[PDB]
Amino acid sequence: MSPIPLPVTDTDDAWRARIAAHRADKDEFLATHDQSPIPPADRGAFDGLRYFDIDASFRVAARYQPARDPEAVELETTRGPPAEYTRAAVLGFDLGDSHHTLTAFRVEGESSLFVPFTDETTDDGRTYEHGRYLDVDPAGADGGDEVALDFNLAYNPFCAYGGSFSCALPPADNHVPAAITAGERVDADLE
């Protein structure tokens, strides 16, 4: 907008606070709220969701380029009919062995961008193999600015909890040739 997006990680106090509050949200949402119920067997054994240590190394700075021509694309779902998401942005970053460019979609009413992507750890099945969601703050950025891709906040669809929801299966172009060990872990056993 006016300053180049960079304090998108606010301060590390408020970044850690973001993560703690966001996982506390993903902790209580399916346990207390009826909108996404965990199956009564697993919900009875509910102690709390997975928390990984705040990973600064998996928080990379990604060169923000908004979709100059934003359109509704069809992502496949395990739920049934495919889910249309509008192209909000594309983030150009480097990780592991390779530089990649990752597609950020718009969720209606949500200010945070939904990035469905895959990598070597999802291919390994010990993170959500059908795809990861990333909550990316645009901070009103434009072509040639940057935003923080904190992969530590690469989360899993609510299907992983034993529910039947819509997981936006991304194109193969959203696959990174790297293992992103920080996230919420999942298993082909569960999901």
Automatic annotation (TrEMBL):
Pfam families per record: DUF1684
InterPro entries for this protein: DUF1684
Name of this chain's protein: DUF1684 family protein
Domain of life: Archaea
Organism encoding this protein: Halobacterium salinarum (strain ATCC 700922 / JCM 11081 / NRC-1)
